[PDB]
Design an enzyme around this catalytic site. Structure first.
Site, PDB file in Angstrom:
ATOM      1  N   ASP A 351      91.933  55.655  53.835  1.00 48.29           N
ATOM      2  CA  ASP A 351      91.828  56.833  54.663  1.00 48.29           C
ATOM      3  C   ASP A 351      92.542  57.975  53.920  1.00 48.29           C
ATOM      4  O   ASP A 351      93.426  57.734  53.116  1.00 48.29           O
ATOM      5  CB  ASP A 351      92.516  56.550  55.983  1.00 48.29           C
ATOM      6  N   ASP A 703      95.752  54.804  58.991  1.00 48.51           N
ATOM      7  CA  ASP A 703      96.732  55.085  60.022  1.00 48.51           C
ATOM      8  C   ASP A 703      96.060  55.259  61.376  1.00 48.51           C
ATOM      9  O   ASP A 703      96.715  55.257  62.415  1.00 48.51           O
ATOM     10  CB  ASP A 703      97.463  56.372  59.675  1.00 48.51           C
ATOM     11  N   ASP A 707      90.281  53.797  61.584  1.00 49.67           N
ATOM     12  CA  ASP A 707      90.394  52.910  60.436  1.00 49.67           C
ATOM     13  C   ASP A 707      90.443  51.460  60.876  1.00 49.67           C
ATOM     14  O   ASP A 707      90.389  50.560  60.027  1.00 49.67           O
ATOM     15  CB  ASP A 707      91.681  53.172  59.669  1.00 49.67           C
TER      16      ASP A 707
END
Ligand SMILES: Nc1ncnc2c1ncn2[C@@H]1O[C@H](COP(=O)(O)OP(=O)(O)CP(=O)(O)O)[C@@H](O)[C@H]1O
Ligand SMILES: CC(=O)C1=C(O)N2[C@H](C1=O)[C@H]1c3c[nH]c4cccc(c34)C[C@H]1C2(C)C
Ligand SMILES: [K+]
Ligand SMILES: [Mg+2]
Ligand SMILES: [Mn+2]
Ligand SMILES: [Mn+2]
Length: 994
Positions: A351, A703, A707
């Site tokens: 990410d 985070d 995700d």
């Protein structure tokens, strides 16, 4: 109801046949509850500890040592009136090991916290509806909401279902959709059709998604879908697709289970064929009670000898210690095997926002006007440092720090930034960090004002809580905010009307301070501020300023820019209507342009260096982001995923562009491209899945809730310490201090761990080979077993236990992070290495039977010399005349087995030294390298001596101590195992593959 985003509001209303000012009837709600079910996500359990331990005793190999536990049990129950004293130690030491390996097996494989439960945190208990039976809003259980419901949402609400917006009641509806995009900046919603059938969530500006929340405003919508048919429901379903995967070696373990469980079955019928060999001459002197019992005795000894018990313990210990090392770097490993799995990683998906970057929006560039010379127009540009909301960083001019208060235009810029602003900054005393309060893009302005400190306010002695808004507060003491012209979509700006505080000196007259999208604000400026003077805005000047702003918005920069202006002579308050946002644009005309600020969400300092170290280790990094493509690429350039001038046409894709590729090309894109943008939670797992379909061991770092699916799908999911609970509970490892470098460190640790594991597994298995060779030699030939299970169990669990654990403490290599990742397919033995300790194993298997039978014939005490008669002890009771000059019981003496055991122990202790290295001779690599191996063997040896010399011990283990001649014989028959493998190292480092 599908495709709500492309339907108009009238089409959605007509679909359910409902009025927006009435809602569903209670009967309809009842019918829709029937048809669509309640608005909730199913809980996902995960087996009681009951059904987990049960599964430990299911895989084939474990049964083999349970079979040899129950057979051991029976063949220790119906034991003669002899030693029923300790016959039950065997079926209990075994039955204990299977207990211990199960409790440990669960203590590492069980994931305590549930990620679907964390997800349900985003499910509000309550929602608000209009139903036909009441005019007024009704506050109900969210699970009772159904498709077709007219729902009302407002500031602070969690959105209860997927909803087509019908009508926005405030001037704007601002939504935080980070759970689906990772991005915390508010989305401004509207009610028009989004015609694209393939609109990604970031496009559906007329939808509200369950589990997101309203940062501002009030709206009415109609529910399109509830339950699992929602965006958050899709996330839930991908997390529920629980594949419960396993470490490459843990799949090798599961594999070797199948391997060894057949090897035993074959060897047992093979013993039977040589047991049936002398079945044609049993002279029926002992019927078959002796035969069918001697055979099971062998099976228990073979099964015990083959299975390397203690292996689950040394591994768990190795892993657990590994976890302790990573914890000291602030990497919290939540799954024991994972600490090693990272070592095999070839691709790390990441990410961007809050992962690669700080997720703290920062003004990093600004400008004001220095001079206007007719047509030419000179800008004064500054850069600002710092990458968090913490008011730490400085304003720079040509890369040197300056005092912002030096420049009147900056004082004014700061003033607008401070006042034209609904947010602030807050120091969270519990977390120890500054946090925004309000919109990210506004808190960036607040943070800027604090760094600029245009009034040179003393701030060094403030507590961090007071320091948070100190310089903004000083500006509040000068201008009093009287009212706000809030943001509207038509003008893309907002403004605040201010009067000079009582006791002016500042300046006389009221002011309007304006910020907004550059183009619309600048079009409404007739003047430009130069210092404290003001000059007419001209075409060429407007064009210069817009051009620079456009460069800032698309560069290697790609910054969000705001233009800042003030209306010098505002209307009189009484001439302005505040209840009608349509009038606000006109109130914000005849402006004076002041300056521009450009912000971005910037990389964490260590990310660039970490990507490079990954690259040096043959690991690719791929950014996968919910954010726009321009920004995504720009960050990739800053962090070295792409070169600063690299052309990335086919190296960077939106989720849509990626979706548009033929299925074959989608797979190849995943090998070529390193940036995927404007992506949905599903795209991330899809990419991970493609990567894995090249058998790449892949990691995901994130985070966000968005995700979570990729975190689960990856072999190893890694969450940021400051990220969401959902991402953390979806991960195998958490970086508690957000330090991206720790991943690089975790890979090295995992590679070190892998090397030590594979070789302590070889050391432990070379042992189990000799034992089998022994338990087969002293079975086929018709010899009295040189070793019995209770002794083998001690060796495998304890004698070889310590040294194996010692090898898991060998020093990692120096080039360990300069090799590419190992292939996942790579075995644990190949050609040379297999026959390597099948040779060492052929030695221990013989030298043990060879030193036990030695005690019979060519030894002193020494019944003894019987030769062919030794391979025929079954007929000493019957055919006694053969055995003259000897007793018929000394065939069950403890000394010869003590000889055998003392050989095994001595061979394996030596076999631990040659296990220090795979190829390097002990000549070239000292035996004094791993000191802990020395203390480990000396312990194993002093434990061996013990069971030889403590009144109970040698009866339970059937041993009788050895003379110093019985030990000279042991050493001269064991020590050569060193020179054997030592020459096997000389014939591998030169003439094989070195
Ligand atoms: N509260 C506020 N005050 C002033 N200007 C604001 C503002 N909120 C947003 N803006 C400005 O107005 C613009 C309006 O944003 P908008 O809803 O058009 O989205 P966007 O253009 O960033 C969306 P997308 O990336 O999905 O296409 C922002 O880009 C910003 O410059
Ligand atoms: C009760 C229990 O859970 C277990 C066990 O009881 N064990 C291990 C095991 O997992 C067995 C096992 C399965 N696959 C392999 C590969 C290599 C070594 C081992 C195994 C040791 C096995 C045993 C029987 C010690
Ligand atoms: K995972
Ligand atoms: Mg994120
Ligand atoms: Mn198990
Ligand atoms: Mn927009």
């Amino acid at each position: 109801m599908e495709a709500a985003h492309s339907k108009s509001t009238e089409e959605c209303l007509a679909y359910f046949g409902v009025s927006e000012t009435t809602g569903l009837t209670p009967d309809q709600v009842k019918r829709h509850l029937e048809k669509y079910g309640h608005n909730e996500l199913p809980a996902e359990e995960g087996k009681s500890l009951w059904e987990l331990v049960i599964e430990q005793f299911e895989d084939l190999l474990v049964r083999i040592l349970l079979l040899a536990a129950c057979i051991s049990f029976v063949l220790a129950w119906f034991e003669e009136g002899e030693e029923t004293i300790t016959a039950f130690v065997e079926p209990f030491v075994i039955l204990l090991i299977l207990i211990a390996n199960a409790i440990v097996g669960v203590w590492q494989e069980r994931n305590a916290e549930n990620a679907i439960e964390a997800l349900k945190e985003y499910e509000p208990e309550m929602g608000k509806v209009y139903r036909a039976d009441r005019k007024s809003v009704q506050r109900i259980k969210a699970r009772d909401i159904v498709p077709g419901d007219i729902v009302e949402v407002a500031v602070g609400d969690k959105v209860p279902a997927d909803i087509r917006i019908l009508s926005i009641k405030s001037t704007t509806l601002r939504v935080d959709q980070s759970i689906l995009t990772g991005e915390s900046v508010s989305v401004i919603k509207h009610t028009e059709p989004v015609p694209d059938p393939r609109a990604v969530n970031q496009d559906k500006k007329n939808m509200l998604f369950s589990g997101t929340n309203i940062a501002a405003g009030k709206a009415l919508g109609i529910v399109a879908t509830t339950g699992v048919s929602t965006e958050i429901g899709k996330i839930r379903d991908q997390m529920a697709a629980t594949e419960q995967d396993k470490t490459p070696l843990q799949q090798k373990l599961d594999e070797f289970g199948e391997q060894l469980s057949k090897v035993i079955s074959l060897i047992c019928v093979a013993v039977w064929l040589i047991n049936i060999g002398h079945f044609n001459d049993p002279v029926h002197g002992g019927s078959w009670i002796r035969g069918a019992i001697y055979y099971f005795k062998i099976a228990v000894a073979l099964a015990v000898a083959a299975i390397p018990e203690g292996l689950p313990a040394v591994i768990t210990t190795c892993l657990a210690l590994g976890t302790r090392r990573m914890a000291k770097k602030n990497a919290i490993v939540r799954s024991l095997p994972s600490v090693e799995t990272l070592g095999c990683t070839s691709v790390i998906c990441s990410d961007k926002t809050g992962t690669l970057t700080t997720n703290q929006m920062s003004v990093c560039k600004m400008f004001i006007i220095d001079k206007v010379d007719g047509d030419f127009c000179s800008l004064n540009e500054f850069s600002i440092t710092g990458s968090t909301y913490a008011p730490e960083g400085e304003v720079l001019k040509n890369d040197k720090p300056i005092r912002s208060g030096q420049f009147d235009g900056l004082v004014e810029l700061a003033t607008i930034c401070a006042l034209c602003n609904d947010s602030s900054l807050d120091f969270n005393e519990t977390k120890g960090v500054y946090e925004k309060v309000g919109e990210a893009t506004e808190t960036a302005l607040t943070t800027l004002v604090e760094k600029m400190n245009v009034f040179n306010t003393e701030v060094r002695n403030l507590s961090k809580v007071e320091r948070a808004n100190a310089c903004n507060s000083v500006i509040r003491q000068l201008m009093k905010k009287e009212f706000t012209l809030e943001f509207s979509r038509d003008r893309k700006s907002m403004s605040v009307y201010c009067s000079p505080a009582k006791s002016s000196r500042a300046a006389v007259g009221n002011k309007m301070f304006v910020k907004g999208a550059p183009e619309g604000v600048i079009d409404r400026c007739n003047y430009v501020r130069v210092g404290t003077t003001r000059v007419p805005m001209t075409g060429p000047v407007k064009e210069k300023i817009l051009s620079v702003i456009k460069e800032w918005g698309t560069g290697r920069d790609t910054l969000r820019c705001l233009a800042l202006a003030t209306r010098d002579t505002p209307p009189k308050r009484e001439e302005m209507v505040l209840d009608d946002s349509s009038r606000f644009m006109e109130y914000e005309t005849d402006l004076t342009f002041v300056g521009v600020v450009g912000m971005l969400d910037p990389p964490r300092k260590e990310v660039m260096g970490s990507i490079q170290l990954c690259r040096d280790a043959g690991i690719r990094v791929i950014m996968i982001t919910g954010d726009n493509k321009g920004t995504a690429i720009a960050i990739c350039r800053r962090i070295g995923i792409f070169g600063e001038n690299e052309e990335v046409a086919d190296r960077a894709y939106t989720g849509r562009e990626f979706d548009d590729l033929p299925l074959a090309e989608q797979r190849e894109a995943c090998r070529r491209a390193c940036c995927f943008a404007r992506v949905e939670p599903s795209h991330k797992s899809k990419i991970v899945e493609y990567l894995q379909s090249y058998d790449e061991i892949t990691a995901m770092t994130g985070d966000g809730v968005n995700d979570a699916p990729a975190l689960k799908k990856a072999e190893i999911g890694i969450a940021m310490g400051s990220g969401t609970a959902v991402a953390k509970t979806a991960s195998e490892m958490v970086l508690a201090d957000d330090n991206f470098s720790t991943i690089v460190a975790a890979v090295e640790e995992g590679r070190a761990i892998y090397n030590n594991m594979k070789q302590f597994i070889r050391y432990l298995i070379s042992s189990n080979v000799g034992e089998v060779v022994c338990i087969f030699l002293t079975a086929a030939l018709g010899l009295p077993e040189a070793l019995i299970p209770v002794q083998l169990l001690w060796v495998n669990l304890v004698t070889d236990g310590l040294p194996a654990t010692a090898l898991g403490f060998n020093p990692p290599d120096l080039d360990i992070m300069d090799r590419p990742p190992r292939s996942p397919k790579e075995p644990l033995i190949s050609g040379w290495l297999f026959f390597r300790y099948m040779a060492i194993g052929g030695y221990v298997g013989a030298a043990t039977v060879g030193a036990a039978a030695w005690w019979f014939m060519y030894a002193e005490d020494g019944p003894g010399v019987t030769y062919h008669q030794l391979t025929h002890f079954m007929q000493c009771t019957e055919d006694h005349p053969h055995f003259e000059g000897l007793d018929c019981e000394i065939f069950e003496a403890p000394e010869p087995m003590t000889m055998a055991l003392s050989v095994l122990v001595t061979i394996e202790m030596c076999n631990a030294l040659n296990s220090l290295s795979e190829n390097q001779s002990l000549m070239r690599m000292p035996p004094w390298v791993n000191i802990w191996l020395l203390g480990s063997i000396c312990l194993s040896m002093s434990l061996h001596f013990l069971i030889l010399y403590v009144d109970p011990l040698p009866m339970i283990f059937k041993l009788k101590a050895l003379d110093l001649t019985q030990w000279l014989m042991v050493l001269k028959i064991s020590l050569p195992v060193i020179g054997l493998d030592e020459i096997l190292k000389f014939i591998a480092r030169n003439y094989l593959e070195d």
